[PDB]
Amino acid sequence: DTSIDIEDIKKILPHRYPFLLVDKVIYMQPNKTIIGLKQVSTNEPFFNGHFPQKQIMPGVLQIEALAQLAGILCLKSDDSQKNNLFLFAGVDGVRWKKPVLPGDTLTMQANLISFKSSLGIAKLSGVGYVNGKVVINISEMTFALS
Amino acid sequence: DTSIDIEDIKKILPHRYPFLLVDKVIYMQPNKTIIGLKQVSTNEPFFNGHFPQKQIMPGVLQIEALAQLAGILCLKSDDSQKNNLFLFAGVDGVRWKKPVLPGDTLTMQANLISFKSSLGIAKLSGVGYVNGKVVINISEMTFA
Amino acid sequence: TSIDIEDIKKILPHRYPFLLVDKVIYMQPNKTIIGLKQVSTNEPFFNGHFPQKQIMPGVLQIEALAQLAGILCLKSDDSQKNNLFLFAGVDGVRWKKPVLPGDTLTMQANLISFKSSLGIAKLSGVGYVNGKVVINISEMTFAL
Amino acid sequence: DTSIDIEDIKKILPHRYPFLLVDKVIYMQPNKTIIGLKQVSTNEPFFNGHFPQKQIMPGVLQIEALAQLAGILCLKSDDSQKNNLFLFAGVDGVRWKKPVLPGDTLTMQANLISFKSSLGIAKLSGVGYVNGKVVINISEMTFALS
Amino acid sequence: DTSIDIEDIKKILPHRYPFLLVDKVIYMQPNKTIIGLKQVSTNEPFFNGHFPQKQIMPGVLQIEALAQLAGILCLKSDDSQKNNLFLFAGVDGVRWKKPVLPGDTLTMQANLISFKGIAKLSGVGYVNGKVVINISEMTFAL
Amino acid sequence: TSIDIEDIKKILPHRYPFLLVDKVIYMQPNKTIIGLKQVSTNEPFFNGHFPQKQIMPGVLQIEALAQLAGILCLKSDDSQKNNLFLFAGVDGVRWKKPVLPGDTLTMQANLISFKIAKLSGVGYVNGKVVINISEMTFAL
Numbered sequence A, D: 001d002t003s004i005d006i007e008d009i010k011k012i013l014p015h016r017y018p019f020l021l022v023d024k025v026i027y028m029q030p031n032k033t034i035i036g037l038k039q040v041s042t043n044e045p046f047f048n049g050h051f052p053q054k055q056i057m058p059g060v061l062q063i064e065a066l067a068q069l070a071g072i073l074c075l076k077s078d079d080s081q082k083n084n085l086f087l088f089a090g091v092d093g094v095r096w097k098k099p100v101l102p103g104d105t106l107t108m109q110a111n112l113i114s115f116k117s118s119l120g121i122a123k124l125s126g127v128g129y130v131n132g133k134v135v136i137n138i139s140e141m142t143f144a145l146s
Numbered sequence B: 001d002t003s004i005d006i007e008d009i010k011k012i013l014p015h016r017y018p019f020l021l022v023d024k025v026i027y028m029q030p031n032k033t034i035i036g037l038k039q040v041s042t043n044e045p046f047f048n049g050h051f052p053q054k055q056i057m058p059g060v061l062q063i064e065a066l067a068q069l070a071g072i073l074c075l076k077s078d079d080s081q082k083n084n085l086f087l088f089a090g091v092d093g094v095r096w097k098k099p100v101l102p103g104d105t106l107t108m109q110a111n112l113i114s115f116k117s118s119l120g121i122a123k124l125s126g127v128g129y130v131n132g133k134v135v136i137n138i139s140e141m142t143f144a
Numbered sequence C: 001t002s003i004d005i006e007d008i009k010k011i012l013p014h015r016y017p018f019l020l021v022d023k024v025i026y027m028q029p030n031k032t033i034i035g036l037k038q039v040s041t042n043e044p045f046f047n048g049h050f051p052q053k054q055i056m057p058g059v060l061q062i063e064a065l066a067q068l069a070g071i072l073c074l075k076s077d078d079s080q081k082n083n084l085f086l087f088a089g090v091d092g093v094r095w096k097k098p099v100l101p102g103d104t105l106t107m108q109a110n111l112i113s114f115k116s117s118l119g120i121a122k123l124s125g126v127g128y129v130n131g132k133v134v135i136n137i138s139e140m141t142f143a144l
Numbered sequence E: 001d002t003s004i005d006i007e008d009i010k011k012i013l014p015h016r017y018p019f020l021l022v023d024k025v026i027y028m029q030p031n032k033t034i035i036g037l038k039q040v041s042t043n044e045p046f047f048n049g050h051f052p053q054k055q056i057m058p059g060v061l062q063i064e065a066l067a068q069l070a071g072i073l074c075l076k077s078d079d080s081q082k083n084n085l086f087l088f089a090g091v092d093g094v095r096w097k098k099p100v101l102p103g104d105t106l107t108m109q110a111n112l113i114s115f116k117g118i119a120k121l122s123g124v125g126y127v128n129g130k131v132v133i134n135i136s137e138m139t140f141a142l
Numbered sequence F: 001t002s003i004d005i006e007d008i009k010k011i012l013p014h015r016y017p018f019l020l021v022d023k024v025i026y027m028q029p030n031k032t033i034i035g036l037k038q039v040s041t042n043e044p045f046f047n048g049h050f051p052q053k054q055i056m057p058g059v060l061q062i063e064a065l066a067q068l069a070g071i072l073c074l075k076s077d078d079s080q081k082n083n084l085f086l087f088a089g090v091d092g093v094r095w096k097k098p099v100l101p102g103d104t105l106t107m108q109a110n111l112i113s114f115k116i117a118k119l120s121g122v123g124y125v126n127g128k129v130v131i132n133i134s135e136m137t138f139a140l
C-alpha cells in the first residue's frame, strides 16, 4: 500500500477548504522524502480570479501545495511536539518553468534537509512536475512550529 | 494532437464555475466517441457538503460531467444548430460501482448512439473510470 | 408530518452547498414523502449554469428528490444507525420543463421496496412547478 | 401585469450574485407601487454564517431585498437619468416581527412616496410578508442616485 | 481596554463566514460603549454583486457590522442569559453619509441606551475620522 | 498619484478571489510603488487557514506585493500591451510577524531591473516589518 487519502491528510494537517492543496500522498519515508499530488480542476475557487480570460494556477499556491506536502513529512517524522499549526518562516530559490493548467496532475516531491526539533525549525527542498517535466523548483522552505 | 483544453472547452460549452465539470478532452471522433477527464480535488466547493465527515464526489455530478463531455461531441459533430445551450432531456441505466474520491482522476467515455437529423435529439452512452476500474455506468443520456 | 430545515439536518449528513431539501411538508413512514426546494438566484450553482441564462441543473433535481427519498428511508427504519446512504443507481429520468429562479419545486418520492439490513431501497419520484410536471424518475436505488 | 423574470431584472439592476435578492416582480405600477418575491432556500451562501446552529435570514438582507425591489420601481418609473447605480441614503422605522426561514417565500411590496428628478431623491415605504403575515415593516427608505 | 481579538469574537458571537462583520474590538466598557473595526477589502464575497462596475460596501452590511458590535457589548455586559443568538428587532434613523470602499478602515462605536432580552443601542461608523453611517436606535431580541 | 480600485481592475487582470491590492496610495513610474491590502475576517481563505486560528497565509502576502509590483510595471511601460504577467521566480522571503484580521497591510515594491522585470518588496503592519522580499521576477 504505502498510500494516504484526504481523510487521513486532514488528521495530520489543520488546513481546510479552500486552502488544503494536497489531495494525496503516494509515497513517504520519515525523516527523508515525501511524494504526493494535487489535482488541478477548473472547478476550483481561485481560477475565476486568476484569470477571467485565461486559467493558470497561481504559482504562489504551487508553493503552498509543496509546503503542505513538506509539512506532512515533518509531522510524521516527528510528533513529539503535539502541535500541527505549521507556519512559513522563509522561502528561497523559487523558479517557475511552466504554467500549471486545469487538467494537469501536479506531482510533488519534497526532501527534508535539516531538523532541530527542540526549536521548531525545518528546512526542505521541493520540486513539482506535470507529465514528468519540471514546473516549479524550490531551493529552501523554512517552517516554524508555533 | 486532437485534444481540447479548458479555454476551448469554454468556447464550446456555456457552463462555468462551479458547474463546468470537464477539465480536458483527450480524444474525440466526430459523430462517434469522445474521451475526456475531470480531476478530483479536495479544493472543490461541493466536498464540504458531501460530506463533512467523508468526502465523496456526488454521483449526480458524475452524471453531469459525463453529460457535459457528451455535449461537446454533439456540438462538434454538428454545429448547424448554432446554439450551445443543450438541456438534459432524460437519463437511463445509471449504476454507481465505486466511490470517486479526492486524488482520483475521473476518465470518461461517452459514445454517440443516435442523432435525429429529422426529429431532433441526441442519445449517448457513458462510462467513467478511476485507475482503469469502472466507477459509473450510463446506458442512455438523452439530449435536446 | 412537517419537518423543518433544522430537523432535516438532524436526519441527513448533507451540508452547504449540497443540501437540497428546504422543507418536508408531508410524510408517511414506509410509503410516501412530500417536500419542497425554493429556487432562488442567490444559489451558488446559478452563476455556472448558466451565465447567460439561469436554469437549475436537472441533476440537482435528481439530487433533491433523492435527498427527500433518503429522509423517508431513515425515518421509516433507523435500526441501521447509518445516515450515510449512497446513490447506487437511478433509472428512467425525464426532464419536461426548465426549473428557474422564482420557482418552488414541490417534490414527491414513493417508496417501492426496502430490503431491511441488506440496505437496498427502491423509490419513485416526481417534481412539480405550479402543479406542472418538471421531473419524473422511475426508480432511485440506494445502498443504505 | 408583465411578470418580470430573473433575466429582465438583471437588465434593470446592476446587482449580481451574491447580492441580488429579487427573484421575481409579479406586479408593477410606474410611479405608484411594486410587488415581488424572494425565495428563501438553505442553499444560499449567507445561511452558513447566520447561524450555524439555526438558519435565519439576516434582517438586514430583508431590508436590501425591499430596497432592490423599490429600486426597480424607480428605474421603471423614470429612466431619464440613465444611471442604474442607486445607493441607499437613509432608512427609517424598520421593525422585524417574524423570523424568515429556509422554505419560506418572502413576498415584498414597496410604495413610492416622493421622487425629485433633481438629484435621485426617492422616498419609499416597504412591507414584507411570509404566508400573508407581516415579517418586515419599513416606514421610509431614502435612495440617492449617483 | 484589553482587546478582544478575532478568535475570542467567535466565542462570543455565533456569526460565521460570510456573515461575521467585526474584525476586532479595540475598546469595550461593559454596560456603556464598544469600539471596533472592520477592514474593508476587495477580497470579500459581496463585492462582485455590489457592484460589477463599481465596488461599494452595501449600506445594510454596515448596519450589520454595527449590530454585531452592539451584540458583543450586550453579551459581555450580561451573560446570565447564556444564549448568544440575539436577533434584530428594530432599527431607526439610519443616514448613510459616504461610500465605504475597498481600502478603507471602518471604525465603529455602539452605545448602550437601555437594557431590560430587550436592548437598545446607538451606532456610528467612521472612515478616516469622517462619519460614514449614523444609527439612532438598534433594537434587539433573544 | 493616488488611486481607487476601479482603475486597479483596468490595469491588473486578477479578480475575486485573487485580487489582493485594495488601494495604491503612491506610484513613481520606473521607480517605487506604495499600496495597501485590508485584512478582514470576511475573506474566503481564512476559514481554511486556520479553523482554530486565523492567520493570513504567507504565500498570499507574496501575491499582494507582487500584484502591487505588476501595477508599477504596467504603468512604467505598456508598450507591451499584455497585462497578463506571470511569476517566474521569487527569492529571499522572510516572514517576521503574523498578519491577522484587523490589520492594515502597507506594501512597498521597488523596481530593480527591466529589459524581464525584477523587484524588491516589503510589507508593514503598524510601521513594523511583517514581510521582506529581496527579489521578485516576472515574465510578460
Ligand SMILES: Clc1ccc(OCc2ccccc2)c2ncccc12
Pocket: A050, A056, A057, A058, A059, A060, A096, F062, F063, F064, F065, F066, F067, F068, F069, F070, F071, F084, F085, F086, F087, F088, F138
Ligand atoms: Cl504581474 C502578475 C501576473 C500574474 C500573477 O499571478 C500569479 C502567478 C504566479 C506564478 C506563476 C504565474 C502566475 C501575478 N501574481 C503575483 C504578482 C504579480 C502577478
Ligand SMILES: Clc1ccc(OCc2ccccc2)c2ncccc12
Pocket: B050, B056, B057, B058, B059, B060, B096, C062, C063, C064, C065, C066, C067, C069, C070, C071, C084, C085, C086, C087, C088, C142
Ligand atoms: Cl440518501 C443520499 C445520501 C447521499 C447522497 O449524496 C449523493 C451521492 C451520489 C452518488 C453516490 C453517493 C452519494 C445522496 N444523493 C442523492 C440522493 C440521495 C442521497
Ligand SMILES: Clc1ccc(OCc2ccccc2)c2ncccc12
Pocket: B063, B064, B066, B067, B068, B070, B071, B072, B084, B085, B086, B087, B088, B089, C049, C055, C056, C057, C058, C059, C095
Ligand atoms: Cl450539453 C449540456 C448543456 C447544459 C447542461 O446543463 C445541465 C442541465 C440539466 C438538466 C436540464 C438542463 C440543463 C447539461 N447538463 C448535463 C449534460 C449536458 C448538458
